[PDB]
Amino acid sequence: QSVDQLIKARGKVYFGVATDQNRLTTGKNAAIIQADFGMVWPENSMQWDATEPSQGNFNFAGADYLVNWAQQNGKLIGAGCLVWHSFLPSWVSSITDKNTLTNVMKNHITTLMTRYKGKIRTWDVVGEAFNEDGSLRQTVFLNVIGEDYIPIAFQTARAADPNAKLYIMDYNLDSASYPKTQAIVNRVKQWRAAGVPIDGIGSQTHLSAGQGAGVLQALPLLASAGTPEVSILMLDVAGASPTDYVNVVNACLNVQSCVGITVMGVADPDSAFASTTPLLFDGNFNPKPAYNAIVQDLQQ
């Protein structure tokens, strides 16, 4: 049974998954995505180091394949991350002029978003901008441009494709008493009051065993920032306990503005954390107990 169809029946937009070309051509990934998921994200093919490995010169072969596949199969598309220190090529992190880096960042955003204009439901514009104590992470963008880089990125993105929902995303937003959770709420409220077009907060939900329960309180706190949408993305859970997965799903159902959930991958062996077997399908592409528990939870 399709978790995407069932979550849509409960009033949400999608249950999605991250993938890319060589997953769609191997294993049983394409068949599972076709049957069970409503939205696809590029795992790597839209990141900066994959799309702009040298200045002004873009690589789109991998991203084009995924966008075309999604359109042919009637799936929604999410994409990202436009500005994320973890996937920056060296040529960007060696720029020291504020004007130059601003133009480089705007060109990167505008080029990617224009190519797929109108085809992408959600863009992750800025990722992992916060330290664990809630201060802003001292990346090349903060050091060279200053805190204005976040407003600039979102303004540029809105102009490039007004149809897309624009998100900021971060991890370790899984507990309501963790300082980073309240910090992103504080800053997003301030940015939206200044007219910055942040449509969503995406919570990168990479969980250890037993941490699902905390999301029931953290996700409503994230929603208190007043963005139109929030989402769970990059979801995986060490051990893949049904209890942890059901708690995350119910957090989504309890938060009106939470539009859906994206899991990090299909089958355990293709996880970056494969030894923790943290996904919903096993190494033989069989649905795991957590998958069936989600199905039952969505039907009750």
Q: What are the residue ranges spanned by the domains of the chain?
A: 1-300
In this structure, how many other beta carbons lie within 10 angstroms of the beta carbon of residue 254? 13
CA-to-CA separations, 113 to 20, 55, 143, 146, in angstroms, rounded = 18, 17, 25, 23
Q: What is the DSSP string of 241-274?
A: -HHHHHHHHHHHHH-TTEEEEEES-SBGGGSTTG
Please list, in sequence order, all residues whose beta carbon lies within 8 angstroms of the beta carbon of residue 78, skipping any fewer than 6 positions away: 16, 39, 40, 41, 120, 121, 122, 123, 124, 233, 262
**Using an 8 Å Cβ cutoff, are 175 and 142 in contact?**
no
Can you tell me the distance from the alpha carbon of 89 to that of 212, in angstroms, rounded to the nearest whole number?
34
Can you tell me the distance from the alpha carbon of 183 to that of 173, in angstroms, rounded to the nearest whole number?
10
Q: What is the residue whose two structure tokens read 């049957």?
A: 35
**Using an 8 Å Cβ cutoff, are 18 and 47 in contact?**
no
**Using an 8 Å Cβ cutoff, are 29 and 19 in contact?**
yes
In this structure, how many other beta carbons lie within 10 angstroms of the beta carbon of residue 162? 11
Can you tell me the distance from the alpha carbon of 6 to that of 160, in angstroms, rounded to the nearest whole number?
33
In this structure, how many other beta carbons lie within 10 angstroms of the beta carbon of residue 126? 23
In this structure, how many other beta carbons lie within 10 angstroms of the beta carbon of residue 94? 8
Q: What are phi and psi of 190, to 5 degrees?
A: -65, -45
Please provide the size of the chain in residues. Answer: 300
Q: What are phi and psi of 59, to 5 degrees?
A: -115, 110
Resolution of this entry, Å: 1.5
